[PDB]
């Protein structure tokens, strides 16, 4: 029993964290094979113009107490790739994957190439992440672990004026309509990740919390009219299919659980809590719920 | 900016997780140097758990009755001893991934990270606190026994908890790494119940200071309180008494925000009376109590 916000074990990623220094700027890098990946703003804009003026010895890369020698440098979108003379002996089996809003991942927050914390979070529908980051965190990465393969999905680049965070995939493409520049940028109006809330309601049922259940069902169209009114993301037939195993396990059809959510949105919790929470949690996907409620290991 | 429930990076602990098998029972062990630590109930059958005599059960065991697996490698047990509720299995190989470590016993209200494991393999990491009733509200299934709680300060891992059992309310009980249980619990299937749980007051105040540091001031008020008047109100909401030690501990946060501890206590009294009125504090609709004053400073300052 119990339901916690749980991150993947960070060990495979900790062995890849390095410190990258260029001039006065110091941030984090990801050392995989003989390449160190980091945000391109470490050179700071006309990034092609700034990068051409740099030589290999302008970048100081530190892996623990060992200095790595940079033998090449190139740019791919908003990520800087620093070729080093040594392949990382702790390189895990890995992939670079771009994730969709609503998908969750673990973030290994780092400062000066040293991991300080690990937390779980979701890519919001407005493409921001509600993280916990201070100056020097840039270059910290987001990942998922499937079997023994680490899928790197996020690299931290900046904090927006509302305190939320913006970054790229490991190919340097931003999530959301952001640019790596000191300029007026704002996150769009956020919405609730509906399929994730339903997954968390199934996790509550699995843990013995049933007060919110009711005899009612709904059509997918009637629920989506309600979701739009409460700034909830539309629920697709794909989402309904994805919730299938949880629906079969608890004996509560997905549209039956949707009628609980529709009543919770129009009436509130009425002093009650679900899994110790007074708000509807949306940072657990249907796969996270199955993985945690069945003890899948890495 | 931002405030998250944050666990320590688990790498140093992942390299210590092993699988321990004795008969039909399989649980997790912590391999440090040439010793594997695990709950002593691994020697029990489910028909022994009601009233086990661990000295009697252990004396009947030989080294080859314990199968220890570190990844795909079998470790050879060359000795076995019991220390309180923990079994110590001497092995013929020192763990090359042994980090700098300490065994520390923690007090209620203290937080730590849990590396949840099954069959010696880590599956997840989460942050939690020792409750005032000595239980932990974890996320554990059968086979998680032997999973450990830790903190990392500098490069030293301080092991503070080893999971042993789930109580009937779904909460968990365990020991420090010397085998001494937290709370009035015993490693037996006898009827045991956790005492009434209470809110960790010093932790809620620390989290209200974190909210102020992140620009949230809606809950502040022009009032102050005596320490005694605060405790008389707080007790009525099942909140732990706040001691002068707690007031002293909140001193740095009080100096940093410019809000005296007894001034923040009056905000907490008001919040308990009014509720949140549709508002949130640090994205939460409830008062959070699993961040200590030390966690708040570490996360907000480095
Ligand atoms: C936020 N700020 C006023 C800055 O000094 N920045 C300006 C800026 C502009 C563009 C880009 Cl791509 C990066 C940055 C930097 C940036 O966002 N880094 C930070 C990341 N995460 C948490 C941060 C908390 C505090 C400070 C800085 C953080 C540095
Ligand atoms: C709770 N129960 C009736 C059991 O199966 N047990 C009885 C029992 C009694 C004493 C001691 Cl020291 C250990 C145990 C075992 C136990 O608590 N293990 C579990 C640990 N954590 C989460 C668990 C979720 C589910 C099941 C079992 C969990 C096994
Ligand atoms: Cl302590």
From Swiss-Prot, chain A:
Cross-link (Glycyl lysine isopeptide (Lys-Gly) (interchain with G-Cter in ubiquitin)), chain numbering: 5, 83
Stated regulation of activity: Inhibited by pyridone-containing alpha-ketoamides compounds 13a and 13b. In turn, alpha-ketoamide 13b (tert-butyl (1-((S)-1-(((S)-4-(benzylamino)-3,4-dioxo-1-((S)-2-oxopyrrolidin-3-yl)butan-2-yl)amino)-3-cyclopropyl-1-oxopropan-2-yl)-2-oxo-1,2-dihydropyridin-3-yl)carbamate) inhibits SARS-CoV-2 replication in human lung cells. Inhibited ex vivo by michael acceptor inhibitor N3. Inhibited ex vivo by compound 11a and 11b.
Catalytic activity, as annotated: TSAVLQ-|-SGFRK-NH2 and SGVTFQ-|-GKFKK the two peptides corresponding to the two self-cleavage sites of the SARS 3C-like proteinase are the two most reactive peptide substrates. The enzyme exhibits a strong preference for substrates containing Gln at P1 position and Leu at P2 position
Residue span(s) of domain Peptidase C30: 1-298
Domain of life: Viruses
Location of this fragment in the whole protein: 3264 to 3568 of 7096
Listed name of the protein: 3C-like proteinase nsp5
Effect recorded for residue 182 to A: Does not affect ability to cleave and inactivate human TRMT1
Subunit: 3CL-PRO exists as monomer and homodimer. Only the homodimer shows catalytic activity. Interacts with host FBXO22; this interaction promotes the proteasomal degradation of nsp5.
Compartmental location: Host cytoplasm; Host Golgi apparatus; Host nucleus
Membrane topology (Cytoplasmic): 1-298
Job description of the protein: Cleaves the C-terminus of replicase polyprotein at 11 sites. Recognizes substrates containing the core sequence [ILMVF]-Q-|-[SGACN]. Cleaves and inactivates human TRMT1, preventing tRNA guanine(26)-dimethylation of tRNAs. May cleave human NLRP1 in lung epithelial cells, thereby activating the NLRP1 inflammasome pathway. May cleave human GSDMD, triggering alternative GSDME-mediated epithelial cell death upon activation of the NLRP1 inflammasome, which may enhance the release interleukins 1B, 6, 16 and 18. Also able to bind an ADP-ribose-1''-phosphate (ADRP).
Active site: 41, 138
